[PDB]
Amino acid sequence: RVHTCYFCSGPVYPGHGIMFVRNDSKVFRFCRSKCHKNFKMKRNPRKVAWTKAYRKAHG
Amino acid sequence: GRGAASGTKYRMTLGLPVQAIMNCADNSGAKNLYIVSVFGTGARLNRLPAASCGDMVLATVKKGKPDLRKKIMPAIVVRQRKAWRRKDGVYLYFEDNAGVIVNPKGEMKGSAITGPVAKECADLWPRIASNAGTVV
Amino acid sequence: KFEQPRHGSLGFLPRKRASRQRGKVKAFPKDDASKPVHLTAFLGYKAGMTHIVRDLDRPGSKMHKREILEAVTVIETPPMVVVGVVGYVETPRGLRSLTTVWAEHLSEEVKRRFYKNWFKSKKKAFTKYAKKYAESTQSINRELERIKKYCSVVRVLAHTQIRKTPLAQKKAHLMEIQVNGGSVADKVEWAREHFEKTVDIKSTFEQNEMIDVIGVTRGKGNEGTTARWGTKRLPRKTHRGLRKVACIGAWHPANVQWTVARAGNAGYMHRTQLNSKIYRIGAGDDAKNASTDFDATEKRITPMGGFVRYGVVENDFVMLNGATPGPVKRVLTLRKSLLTHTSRKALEPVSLKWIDTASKFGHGRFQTPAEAKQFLG
Amino acid sequence: HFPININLTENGTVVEIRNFLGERITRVIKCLPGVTVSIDEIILEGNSLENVSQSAANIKQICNVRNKDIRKFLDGIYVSERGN
RNA sequence: UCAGACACCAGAAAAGGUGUUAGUUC
RNA sequence: GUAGCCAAAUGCCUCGUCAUCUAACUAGUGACGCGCAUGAAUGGAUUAACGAGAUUCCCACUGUCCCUAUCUACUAUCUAG
RNA sequence: CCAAGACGUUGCAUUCUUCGAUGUCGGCUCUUCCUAUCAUACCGAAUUCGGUAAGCGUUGGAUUGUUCACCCACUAAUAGGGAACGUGAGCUGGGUUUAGACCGUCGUGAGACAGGUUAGUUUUACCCUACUGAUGAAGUGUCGUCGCAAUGGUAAUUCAACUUAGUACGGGAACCGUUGAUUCAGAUCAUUGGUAUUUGCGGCUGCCUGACAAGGCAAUGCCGCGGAGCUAUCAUCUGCCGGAUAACGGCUGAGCCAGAAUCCGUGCCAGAAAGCGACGAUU
RNA sequence: UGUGGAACGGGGUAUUGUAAGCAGUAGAGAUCUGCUGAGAUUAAGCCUUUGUUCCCAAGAUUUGU
Structure with missing residues (x-):
C-alpha cells in the first residue's frame, strides 16, 4: 500500500525513500533524500514553496 | 551465546x-555501553566485529553505577543509527x-525499556519484546 | 602469524577483454529423445531493470505470505527468425559441422551481419544460394538427408529482429540454437518447416523456468590491483603509491607468478550467471503487461520517460529475478538450465502484486501520467 | 521399537527400507541382475550364488547403525539361512 | 598404491611380514 | 654514604613487589628499598613560569581504521617539434 | 624394537663462497608449497584416543620495536613449518642506527661499556626477462559469418535455529528435510546511502561593472539540494551433480560391491596468435 | 538516396524551488503577497518526434582459388 510522505505530502510507493523514527517513537516517512534532509534542518513545510501542505493551506 | 535466541534474524x-558507545535504554542504572565484542563473529582478517539491532554483544559500562562499571556483561543492541533494509x-x-x-x-537485567525497540530485536528476544513499550 | 584467503578466483583468469560481444553458449542441455522437439536458447537485449512487490509463498520462512520487494531485470525479446540449420557429427576429436542449409530468403537485417560495409557493398550475399534454391531443390534435399543420416546434433541458425527494438544498430544478431528432443529426423523436419518463420519466447520458456543468462559484462577499462583484485590499500605513509600489491613474489622462484594480483583490464568479460527465474513473460501487443491482478491500473512495462538509454519496450519481454551481466542495450543469451533443481525457492510459483514503472531517470514519484495529472493541480 | 518398512519395486529388483531405527531417510538398494527378493523375513533367490550373496551383503550394509553402541542398539537385518 | 637399476656417488638402521623362493634341525 | 632521593634519563637480576588506571598494559603514575653500580657546587632535593624537548592518560575531533568509494587540476598517455 | 612402560637398545663447530659492497630485525602487504592435522568430512577404538585426508578455513584486541610470550574476548577452530631465518629500486624506520648530548660503572687521562637514554638524509628502472593487460605480419586463393576444442586454469565454505523429538535411550540423541546466517567468489545499480565541474537550481560574503536587474573576481569563494555516471559484504542478485578411490567394511573363494570435504571429469574462464571444420560472396 | 544521417525546435522525463517585470487597503524602506510548482537547466553516456533546416549517389590504399 501507499503512504503519505511527511514533508512533500505526496505518495511514497514501496521501496522509496527512508522511514525514520525518533527517540519519541514517532514515525516519519520521507520519499526522497531532499525531504529527509530538509526535515533534519527543521524546515517548516508550510513555509517551503514546493510542499503540498503549503499549497493546500495557501490557495 | 547467539544460539539462545528464539527465531532466525535476517x-x-x-x-x-x-x-x-551506545546509550543504555533500560533502567538498570547504566548510562552508556562500550562494545568490546560481538557474538557469532567469524574469522576475517583486519575486520572489526560489528553489531546490528537484535545482536548480542559483550559490553562494559563506561558511565553508571560503580558496581556496574569495571566488568564485562552481555548486551543486546536494540536501536541503531545506521540504515538497514527490511526485506x-x-x-x-x-x-x-x-x-x-x-x-x-x-533475560534482561532491567525492568523497562525507554524508546522504540526494533522489531527484529523484539522477535529474536521475547523478554525484550515483553518489556518494550513500543516496537517499530 | 596470520592467514587470509586468496583475493579473487583463479578460475576466471585470464582477465582479458572478451573476444566476442555476444555471449557464446558453451554448453547445451543434454539431449533427451523422450521430450518433444524444442529450442534450448534465446537471444534478447537488456532493456533495463526495475523492482516489484511480491507475496512470498514459501512455507516455513519468516516472511511467508507477506510482501517482499525484489529487483528485476527487463530484457526485450522480440521473436527470433529461424533462417537455417546446421548439422554436427560426433567424432573421436569432437563435434564437426558436417554441413549447413540456409533458407531461400534472408532478410536485410541478417544479411548485414555478413558485411562490415553494407552501404558500399553490392548486397550480393546468398544471391547465388537463392538462385540454386529456386532452380534445384534436390541439392537442398540431399543436404537435409545427409544431416538426418549422419549428423547427431542439430542446431538452427536464428537471427533477431533488431529493427523492432529501439536500437541504432541494424545488423541482426545471429546464433546457433541446439534443438533437443525427438529423433534427428524430427529435428531436421522441425528446422526445415520453420525456415523463415519466427519463434516466440512464450513457446520456449514457461514463466517460472530457472535459466542461465550469458553475456559480456560492462567494461570498466584498465584498473589497479585494489579495484581489479580487491587487495588492501597500503598505508597513507607509503612512498611511490599505495593502490598496489606490496610484494609480488619471493626470491625463489625468480619470477612473478600467475597467481599474483596485477593491474590491467577489469571488465568487459564473458560471464554465465546461473539460476535466474523468469518472473513474467510479457506480450508486446498487450497493454496490460506490467499491470498485475491485484493492481489493475492498465499500464505497460516501460517507465515514465522511457528506459534510461534504451527507450520504450514495445515487443515481447522477459522479467528476470535480480541482476544480469552487461549494460543496457547489450545482447544477452538466455539458455535452459543444465542442472536439475528441486528446491522450494526454485519451484515456488510467482504471482506479482505491483510492478514499479516510476521514472528511473531521477526520483520518480508517479506510476502513470494519468494519476500524475491527478496529483498536480 | 521402530518397525522397519520394506518396499519391493520392479518385482523385487529394488528394495526400499524405511523407518530404520526411526530414521526418516529411505534407503534404496538395487539388487544385482538375476536376483529376486520377496517377503519380518526377506528371501532372495537367484541362479548366481555370488550375486545373491552380494545383494544380501549390500542390503545388510545399507541397514547399518552408525555412531551408536552396538551392544545396546541391536537393530538391523541379518542373514538367517542360505541354501538351495 | 608412487619397484629396481653398476664402484668412488650423492647416502640409511634395529626389529619385523599368514610376501615368496630356498635351506637347517627337531 | 649523613640530609635527601630512587627499579628515577642511574637497578644487572627484572615483565622487582604492592596499589592505580583498562575488558585485557613488559606502558604511565603512586608507594616500598641491603641501591649490579643513587647522593650532595663532578652540586643534592624541590620548583611557579617558560619549551617546534622526552613521556602517559582524558574529553573534542576526525578516511588513522573497519572498508573503501567519488571528484578536481597537473602528470602519465597519443601527436607535432 | 625387547619383557619387569622402568631397564636397555635402533633411527629421524668449521672458514669452502663473498671485503673494487649480495642493503642488516620486526611489522604491513601479497602469493605459494609441505603435513609432522586445530576445525570441518569419512570410518574405527573406551564427552577420550587413533586411520585415511592439506579440499576449504585458521580472528578482533591490551602491553612490548620484539620472533617467541602473556592476557581479555569471539570462533567450527583460532595447527605448525618452508620459500636467501619468503617479501626495504614494495612500505614504514619502532629495534639496530657513525657524528650531538645525558647518566651509572670502569680508566690518572684521551676514552671504554655485548649497560640505560633521547635526537639522528632510507637514492635510481626508461634496460633484459618474468608477470599483467593491449595490438599484430604471415600457411590455409582473398575477405567475412557461424562453429569445433587440444591444452591451461577452475570454487565455494562453515554454522545456528526449527522439524525429527523430549522420540530413540535411560537426563538426552541422529539421518532426511526446512529456514536463515559466516567466510569466499562473479556480477549488478531498480531501491537506499556516498560522491558533485550538471559549476543544474537556490542561498551568502568581500570587491568590481554608476544604481536596479544581470554578471564577473576570490588559484573550483562558500552553503543547501542535486539528476546522470561511478560506487558500497553501507545496496541487490547468483554460486551443482557424475565417476574412480584412500582409510575401511564386505562378497564369493584374486575379481567384484560398499565408502571421505580426496583425485578425475560435467559445469565455469581462456582459445593453440604456426590446431581445425562448415558456410557466404568472389572484382 | 534512405520508413537515411546531422544540426536545431517541440513534447515527455528529471533537478531545483516560485524567475524578470508590475500592482497593492502587506510592511517595523531589509521583507511579505498576486500572477508564480513558476522560471532556469534537461544528454553532454535520458526518452520521443508526420516539426523546420541541411548533408550524402566518394576520395585514397591493399587485395585472386
Missing part, C-alpha cells in the same frame, strides 16, 4: 562496530544507537 547493515523494502534507522543489559540466557 541480514542487516552492521552499524555498531567494536569500541562503539519488504523499507529502510530503517533510529535516531540513536541504544542497547540493554542482558544475561547470557537472554
Whole structure:
C-alpha cells in the first residue's frame, strides 16, 4: 500500500525513500533524500514553496 | 551465546562496530555501553566485529553505577543509527544507537525499556519484546 | 602469524577483454529423445531493470505470505527468425559441422551481419544460394538427408529482429540454437518447416523456468590491483603509491607468478550467471503487461520517460529475478538450465502484486501520467 | 521399537527400507541382475550364488547403525539361512 | 598404491611380514 | 654514604613487589628499598613560569581504521617539434 | 624394537663462497608449497584416543620495536613449518642506527661499556626477462559469418535455529528435510546511502561593472539540494551433480560391491596468435 | 538516396524551488503577497518526434582459388 510522505505530502510507493523514527517513537516517512534532509534542518513545510501542505493551506 | 535466541534474524547493515558507545535504554542504572565484542563473529582478517539491532554483544559500562562499571556483561543492541533494509523494502534507522543489559540466557537485567525497540530485536528476544513499550 | 584467503578466483583468469560481444553458449542441455522437439536458447537485449512487490509463498520462512520487494531485470525479446540449420557429427576429436542449409530468403537485417560495409557493398550475399534454391531443390534435399543420416546434433541458425527494438544498430544478431528432443529426423523436419518463420519466447520458456543468462559484462577499462583484485590499500605513509600489491613474489622462484594480483583490464568479460527465474513473460501487443491482478491500473512495462538509454519496450519481454551481466542495450543469451533443481525457492510459483514503472531517470514519484495529472493541480 | 518398512519395486529388483531405527531417510538398494527378493523375513533367490550373496551383503550394509553402541542398539537385518 | 637399476656417488638402521623362493634341525 | 632521593634519563637480576588506571598494559603514575653500580657546587632535593624537548592518560575531533568509494587540476598517455 | 612402560637398545663447530659492497630485525602487504592435522568430512577404538585426508578455513584486541610470550574476548577452530631465518629500486624506520648530548660503572687521562637514554638524509628502472593487460605480419586463393576444442586454469565454505523429538535411550540423541546466517567468489545499480565541474537550481560574503536587474573576481569563494555516471559484504542478485578411490567394511573363494570435504571429469574462464571444420560472396 | 544521417525546435522525463517585470487597503524602506510548482537547466553516456533546416549517389590504399 501507499503512504503519505511527511514533508512533500505526496505518495511514497514501496521501496522509496527512508522511514525514520525518533527517540519519541514517532514515525516519519520521507520519499526522497531532499525531504529527509530538509526535515533534519527543521524546515517548516508550510513555509517551503514546493510542499503540498503549503499549497493546500495557501490557495 | 547467539544460539539462545528464539527465531532466525535476517541480514542487516552492521552499524555498531567494536569500541562503539551506545546509550543504555533500560533502567538498570547504566548510562552508556562500550562494545568490546560481538557474538557469532567469524574469522576475517583486519575486520572489526560489528553489531546490528537484535545482536548480542559483550559490553562494559563506561558511565553508571560503580558496581556496574569495571566488568564485562552481555548486551543486546536494540536501536541503531545506521540504515538497514527490511526485506519488504523499507529502510530503517533510529535516531540513536541504544542497547540493554542482558544475561547470557537472554533475560534482561532491567525492568523497562525507554524508546522504540526494533522489531527484529523484539522477535529474536521475547523478554525484550515483553518489556518494550513500543516496537517499530 | 596470520592467514587470509586468496583475493579473487583463479578460475576466471585470464582477465582479458572478451573476444566476442555476444555471449557464446558453451554448453547445451543434454539431449533427451523422450521430450518433444524444442529450442534450448534465446537471444534478447537488456532493456533495463526495475523492482516489484511480491507475496512470498514459501512455507516455513519468516516472511511467508507477506510482501517482499525484489529487483528485476527487463530484457526485450522480440521473436527470433529461424533462417537455417546446421548439422554436427560426433567424432573421436569432437563435434564437426558436417554441413549447413540456409533458407531461400534472408532478410536485410541478417544479411548485414555478413558485411562490415553494407552501404558500399553490392548486397550480393546468398544471391547465388537463392538462385540454386529456386532452380534445384534436390541439392537442398540431399543436404537435409545427409544431416538426418549422419549428423547427431542439430542446431538452427536464428537471427533477431533488431529493427523492432529501439536500437541504432541494424545488423541482426545471429546464433546457433541446439534443438533437443525427438529423433534427428524430427529435428531436421522441425528446422526445415520453420525456415523463415519466427519463434516466440512464450513457446520456449514457461514463466517460472530457472535459466542461465550469458553475456559480456560492462567494461570498466584498465584498473589497479585494489579495484581489479580487491587487495588492501597500503598505508597513507607509503612512498611511490599505495593502490598496489606490496610484494609480488619471493626470491625463489625468480619470477612473478600467475597467481599474483596485477593491474590491467577489469571488465568487459564473458560471464554465465546461473539460476535466474523468469518472473513474467510479457506480450508486446498487450497493454496490460506490467499491470498485475491485484493492481489493475492498465499500464505497460516501460517507465515514465522511457528506459534510461534504451527507450520504450514495445515487443515481447522477459522479467528476470535480480541482476544480469552487461549494460543496457547489450545482447544477452538466455539458455535452459543444465542442472536439475528441486528446491522450494526454485519451484515456488510467482504471482506479482505491483510492478514499479516510476521514472528511473531521477526520483520518480508517479506510476502513470494519468494519476500524475491527478496529483498536480 | 521402530518397525522397519520394506518396499519391493520392479518385482523385487529394488528394495526400499524405511523407518530404520526411526530414521526418516529411505534407503534404496538395487539388487544385482538375476536376483529376486520377496517377503519380518526377506528371501532372495537367484541362479548366481555370488550375486545373491552380494545383494544380501549390500542390503545388510545399507541397514547399518552408525555412531551408536552396538551392544545396546541391536537393530538391523541379518542373514538367517542360505541354501538351495 | 608412487619397484629396481653398476664402484668412488650423492647416502640409511634395529626389529619385523599368514610376501615368496630356498635351506637347517627337531 | 649523613640530609635527601630512587627499579628515577642511574637497578644487572627484572615483565622487582604492592596499589592505580583498562575488558585485557613488559606502558604511565603512586608507594616500598641491603641501591649490579643513587647522593650532595663532578652540586643534592624541590620548583611557579617558560619549551617546534622526552613521556602517559582524558574529553573534542576526525578516511588513522573497519572498508573503501567519488571528484578536481597537473602528470602519465597519443601527436607535432 | 625387547619383557619387569622402568631397564636397555635402533633411527629421524668449521672458514669452502663473498671485503673494487649480495642493503642488516620486526611489522604491513601479497602469493605459494609441505603435513609432522586445530576445525570441518569419512570410518574405527573406551564427552577420550587413533586411520585415511592439506579440499576449504585458521580472528578482533591490551602491553612490548620484539620472533617467541602473556592476557581479555569471539570462533567450527583460532595447527605448525618452508620459500636467501619468503617479501626495504614494495612500505614504514619502532629495534639496530657513525657524528650531538645525558647518566651509572670502569680508566690518572684521551676514552671504554655485548649497560640505560633521547635526537639522528632510507637514492635510481626508461634496460633484459618474468608477470599483467593491449595490438599484430604471415600457411590455409582473398575477405567475412557461424562453429569445433587440444591444452591451461577452475570454487565455494562453515554454522545456528526449527522439524525429527523430549522420540530413540535411560537426563538426552541422529539421518532426511526446512529456514536463515559466516567466510569466499562473479556480477549488478531498480531501491537506499556516498560522491558533485550538471559549476543544474537556490542561498551568502568581500570587491568590481554608476544604481536596479544581470554578471564577473576570490588559484573550483562558500552553503543547501542535486539528476546522470561511478560506487558500497553501507545496496541487490547468483554460486551443482557424475565417476574412480584412500582409510575401511564386505562378497564369493584374486575379481567384484560398499565408502571421505580426496583425485578425475560435467559445469565455469581462456582459445593453440604456426590446431581445425562448415558456410557466404568472389572484382 | 534512405520508413537515411546531422544540426536545431517541440513534447515527455528529471533537478531545483516560485524567475524578470508590475500592482497593492502587506510592511517595523531589509521583507511579505498576486500572477508564480513558476522560471532556469534537461544528454553532454535520458526518452520521443508526420516539426523546420541541411548533408550524402566518394576520395585514397591493399587485395585472386
